[PDB]
């Protein structure tokens, strides 16, 4: 009879529009579990993220809201497409679960890291990552959790970014929610952050692509810092000074390191043959790596500069790189506390609006 229907995927219940068929488990976001599904109406694959009673909690609801809002107003060939949203429940009283339907790409960057890209591929993917991010930043939003498994690709070589649960405007204001290996120093050492925090992640991702493996492995949150300084060498005192005093002592106590040069961090053996024409050169790649992977945020290149960098700008196209920002309904400000119930209503209105 009715509009929705239910499938058990292992221990989890997906109740969804009958259009959505053949769910298969595929993943998780910061919040949420995700299935792939056939949309019998549009006749294509999709991805359905279930968020379970997101209002359960300050955290869960904050993130859920953001992700709802951002998924809506964002508009770029390099961000993942919204397709649908719903809830099977029929009233604010009933209300408990949310579902978000998205384009399904083919794979995440996992996946690419082990294969051997030519420069044109490597550079092109980065170029796309950056356009994506310049889109978000252009409206003042920071992804915060860029990382291979949040970047997806398709076999025609296109690429999009994913998961906005952690996305928000500039920092200060909890630590351990960004994935360990991609934590910028500002994030590791608790100093709060600006948009180029995302740049650090891009650098790690790029490094991983070339390296074949995680750039700064890091066996726990504190060891993370060792891996960074072991490779890049010890930050300057100018930098130390910005640390809070408790963290400053630990840091200044670390064994000093010269660090390797990018030439030694990333030697030619690692790269493919250099390009037919000019700028797609290992050394140019090194040069970009060296302006992204920089401990001191205030000395770190921005996306705009990264788009202008010779290794990247060979694809530069203003209609991709300089598109209008997403418009965020100025209500949503990614910070304010609310209540058990205030949230419950916010999300619901928000799903309602969006249904």
């Amino acid at each position: 009879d009715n509009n929705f229907y239910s499938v058990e995927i292992g221990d989890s219940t997906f109740t969804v529009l009958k259009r959505y068929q053949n769910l298969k488990p595929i993943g998780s976001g910061a919040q949420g579990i995700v299935c792939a599904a056939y949309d019998a109406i549009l006749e294509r694959n999709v991805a359905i993220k279930k968020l379970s009673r997101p209002f359960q909690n300050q955290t869960h609801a904050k993130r859920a809201y953001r992700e709802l809002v951002l998924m809506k107003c964002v508009n770029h060939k390099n961000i993942i497409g919204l397709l649908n949203v719903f809830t099977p429940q029929k009233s604010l009283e009933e209300f408990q679960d949310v579902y978000i339907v998205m384009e399904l790409m083919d794979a995440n960057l996992s996946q690419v890291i082990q294969m051997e890209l030519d420069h044109e591929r490597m550079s092109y993917l980065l170029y796309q990552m950056l356009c994506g991010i310049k889109h978000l930043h252009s409206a003042g939003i920071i992804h915060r959790d860029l990382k291979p498994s949040n970047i997806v690709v398709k076999s025609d070589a296109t690429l999009k970014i994913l998961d906005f649960g952690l996305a928000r405007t500039a920092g200060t204001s909890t630590p351990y929610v960004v994935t360990r290996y991609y934590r910028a120093p500002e994030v590791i050492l608790g100093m709060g952050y600006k948009e180029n925090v995302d740049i650090w992640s891009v650098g790690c991702i790029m490094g991983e692509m070339i390296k074949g493996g995680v750039l700064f492995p890091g066996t726990d949150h504190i060891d993370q810092w060792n891996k960074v300084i072991e490779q890049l060498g010890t930050p300057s005192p100018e930098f130390m000074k910005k640390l809070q005093p408790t963290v400053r002592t630990y840091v200044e106590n670390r064994p000093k390191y010269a660090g390797y040069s990018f030439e030694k961090l990333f030697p030619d053996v690692l790269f493919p043959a250099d390009s037919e024409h000019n700028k797609l050169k290992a050394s140019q790649a090194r040069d970009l790596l060296s302006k992204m992977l920089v401990i001191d945020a205030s000395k770190r290149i921005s996306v705009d500069e990264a788009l202008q960098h010779p290794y990247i700008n060979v694809w530069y196209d203003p209609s991709e790189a300089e598109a209008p920002p997403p418009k965020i309904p100025d209500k949503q400000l990614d910070e304010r506390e609310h209540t058990i119930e205030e949230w419950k209503e916010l999300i619901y209105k928000e799903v309602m609006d969006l249904e």
Binding site: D106, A107, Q111, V112, M115, E120, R121, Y124, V153, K154, S155, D156, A157, S275, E276, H277, L280, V314, W315
Partner: peptide, 10 residues
Amino acid sequence: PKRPTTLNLF
């Protein structure tokens, strides 16, 4: 310099 239009994900 042409954009690639393929990516081998097999």
